[PDB]
Design an enzyme around this catalytic site. Structure first.
Site, short mmCIF file in Angstrom:
data_model
loop_
_atom_site.label_atom_id
_atom_site.label_comp_id
_atom_site.label_asym_id
_atom_site.label_seq_id
_atom_site.Cartn_x
_atom_site.Cartn_y
_atom_site.Cartn_z
N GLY A 167 3.09 5.59 10.47
CA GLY A 167 4.43 5.43 9.96
C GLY A 167 5.13 4.16 10.38
O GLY A 167 6.28 3.94 9.97
N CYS B 70 4.11 1.21 9.53
CA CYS B 70 3.90 0.21 8.50
C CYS B 70 5.25 -0.28 8.00
O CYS B 70 6.19 0.51 7.83
CB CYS B 70 3.10 0.78 7.32
SG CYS B 70 1.40 1.19 7.76
N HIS C 57 0.81 -1.22 0.00
CA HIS C 57 0.00 0.00 0.00
C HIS C 57 0.84 1.27 0.00
O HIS C 57 0.27 2.37 -0.09
CB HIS C 57 -1.02 0.03 1.16
CG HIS C 57 -0.43 0.16 2.53
ND1 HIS C 57 -0.49 -0.86 3.46
CD2 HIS C 57 0.17 1.20 3.16
CE1 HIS C 57 0.07 -0.46 4.59
NE2 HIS C 57 0.48 0.79 4.43
C1 LIG Z 1 1.65 2.99 7.70
F1 LIG Z 1 1.21 4.06 7.05
C2 LIG Z 1 1.12 2.81 9.09
O1 LIG Z 1 1.93 2.49 9.96
N1 LIG Z 1 -0.24 2.90 9.37
C3 LIG Z 1 -0.60 2.63 10.76
C4 LIG Z 1 -0.32 1.37 11.29
N2 LIG Z 1 -0.58 1.01 12.56
C5 LIG Z 1 -1.16 1.92 13.34
C6 LIG Z 1 -1.50 3.18 12.89
CL1 LIG Z 1 -2.27 4.29 13.98
C7 LIG Z 1 -1.22 3.56 11.59
C8 LIG Z 1 -1.30 3.25 8.41
C9 LIG Z 1 -1.58 4.60 8.15
C10 LIG Z 1 -2.58 4.97 7.27
C11 LIG Z 1 -3.34 4.00 6.62
C12 LIG Z 1 -3.10 2.64 6.87
C13 LIG Z 1 -3.91 1.62 6.17
C14 LIG Z 1 -5.27 1.78 5.89
C15 LIG Z 1 -6.00 0.79 5.23
C16 LIG Z 1 -5.38 -0.38 4.83
C17 LIG Z 1 -4.03 -0.53 5.10
CL2 LIG Z 1 -3.18 -1.97 4.63
C18 LIG Z 1 -3.29 0.43 5.76
C19 LIG Z 1 -2.07 2.27 7.77
#
Ligand SMILES: *[C@@H](F)C(=O)N(c1cncc(Cl)c1)c1cccc(-c2cccc(Cl)c2)c1
Ligand SMILES: *[C@@H](F)C(=O)N(c1cncc(Cl)c1)c1cccc(-c2cccc(Cl)c2)c1
Lengths: 306, 306
Positions: free
Chosen positions: A143, A145, A41
């Site tokens: 961030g 991810c 993504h």
């Molecule tokens: C990477 F952008 C990231 O670390 N995201 C994340 C992961 N864990 C906790 C939090 Cl609070 C945030 C992330 C940020 C924005 C969007 C997404 C996302 C949305 C829909 C589907 C997928 Cl695979 C990822 C993740």
């Protein structure tokens, strides 16, 4: 003595962590030999992440659209491809810090260490279990991810998890390192939700054996129970069934403490029906289920890694 | 989101860990530039460790009595000296992996990561707090002596602890890296014991703010309390006093959640008088006191280290 939630030493993984940027999206990648692995993504925009066709989005990309930073050194991308839900970015430099490694997929109930990362920079390390519903109860901010989960076996790193997303209950979902999601989750913005969880019974028993090894004995008793009768109580309290193979796996801990496995089941029964009556076990007032029998033996015996 | 006991990435410390052997005693040492640091009781025998005169024991030793293994590479000792309760072994090779570092001494109530080691080989990493009684509730088996505790500030490792011994309650005692013990403990076999502990009040408040940031709110209320009136309850429950400086340190977390510090004190009051009534906070059924306000801000905001 003492019993702590212990992670593996993270150094071998830290040397693999890189920053991957595509457009305005920056996340983490995992750099091994001449390939950087990261969540696919990364190539999606805000409006893309609604309902995207990843094959369509990727064919529109070029190598130069992917910026990879290994610390303050930039890695030239020379190839890119999709594998399930991960990207594989071919770079022109093999990582000199590549450890001996494997890509394994773990079972719910098993544990691993997570190296949380931001902008390719390691932030902290902690121990997680894969929940029965295939989520993990992690600690992740925007961030993170691309942060990975792993175990260490002598000198070999078994990567088992890459972080992708947070679910609405605050728990976390990801893939193995071949890009196959753990559980029924997709890298799209849908109304997906965790789905019901249970308590990892064999792990709770392992942890009670850790307690006995460490001098907590107040919950022991003379009673015993049958496996069938224990499992009737497990079901009523949202604990998952105990198998004969679980009993066998608990053999060594049983033999070290001299408490038969079914005897300890009898103790767990009473804890479930009576609670803990204002007492604690290994500094917890809850029955803890995120230590495997392996974890107890490693910590209550002392195995290292090189 | 999520909240975990998080250690610092251990890689920078792993590169410093070595094996020190003297006679039949093998423990861990910490190798920085051309000096290896280790507990001075490495030079004691069984009968020595009763009531030893360390100056007498050391003058009888030579450089060649100290065997230092840096992995599978042997380091030649070219000098030795005592500094308080640590030895300093001068070797003929400066560690090429020496990070930027400092020797700091910490305050009870503050936290650090421990890299548990055996035979110079890193085994696992976990987070500890220095208890008010100057013990740590660690996880250590035979041969862990010389394992170190540390914090990381950007790229600089602040070493604050070296492990020496286990006390009869299963808790642990050690020194700073200038060899000065934390608390009233000695590297002799006496009947020393921990002595009474208290709960780190400011940390419990920080952790309640972590909970609110993470969506746990059931323990909030409209009531408030004065600092003097809160401290009267703290005393009755073996909690240590809360200072105006603690209140000031909690300012940012207060401002982020919009819950006044004295309001959260009122909530803690009620939790102490009523217990938790079968509910949990951040997956704990106990009030947790081993996260500083710094720890909460780092994890609930996301600072990295390079
Ligand atoms: C990477 F952008 C990231 O670390 N995201 C994340 C992961 N864990 C906790 C939090 Cl609070 C945030 C992330 C940020 C924005 C969007 C997404 C996302 C949305 C829909 C589907 C997928 Cl695979 C990822 C993740
Ligand atoms: C080092 F030998 C070591 O790690 N010891 C240790 C530390 N923590 C937990 C456990 Cl179970 C064992 C250790 C082993 C034997 C003796 C001593 C010791 C006795 C008296 C005084 C001192 Cl400073 C050390 C420690």
């Amino acid at each position: 003595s003492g019993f702590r939630k212990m992670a593996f030493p993270s150094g071998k993984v830290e040397g693999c962590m890189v920053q991957v940027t595509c457009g305005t999206t920056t996340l983490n990648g995992l750099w091994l030999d001449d390939v950087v692995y990261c969540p696919r993504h990364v190539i999606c925009t805000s409006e893309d992440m609604l309902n995207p066709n990843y094959e369509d989005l990727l064919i529109r990309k070029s190598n130069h659209n992917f910026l990879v930073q290994a610390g303050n050194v930039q890695l030239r991308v020379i190839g890119h491809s999709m594998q399930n839900c991960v990207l594989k970015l071919k770079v022109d430099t093999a990582n000199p810090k590549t450890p001996k490694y494997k890509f394994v997929r773990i079972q719910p109930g098993q544990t691993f260490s997570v190296l949380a990362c931001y902008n390719g920079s390691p932030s902290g390390v902690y121990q997680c279990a894969m929940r029965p519903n295939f989520t993990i109860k992690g600690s992740f901010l925007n961030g993170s991810c691309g942060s990975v989960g792993f175990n260490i076996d002598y000198d070999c790193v078994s990567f088992c998890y890459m972080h992708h997303m947070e679910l609405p209950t605050g728990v976390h979902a990801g893939t193995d390192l071949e890009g196959n999601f753990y559980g029924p989750f997709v890298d799209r913005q849908t109304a997906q939700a965790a789905g019901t969880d249970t308590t990892i019974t064999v792990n709770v028993l392992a942890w009670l054996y850790a307690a006995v090894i460490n001098g907590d004995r107040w919950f022991l008793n003379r009673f015993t129970t049958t496996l069938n009768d224990f499992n009737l109580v497990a079901m009523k309290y949202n604990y998952e069934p105990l198998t004969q193979d679980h009993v066998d796996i608990l053999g060594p801990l049983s033999a070290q403490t001299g408490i038969a496995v079914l005897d300890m089941c009898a103790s767990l029964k009473e804890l479930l029906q009576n609670g803990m009556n204002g007492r604690t076990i290994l500094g917890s007032a809850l029955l803890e289920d995120e230590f495997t029998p392996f974890d107890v033996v490693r910590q209550c015996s002392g195995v290292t890694f090189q």
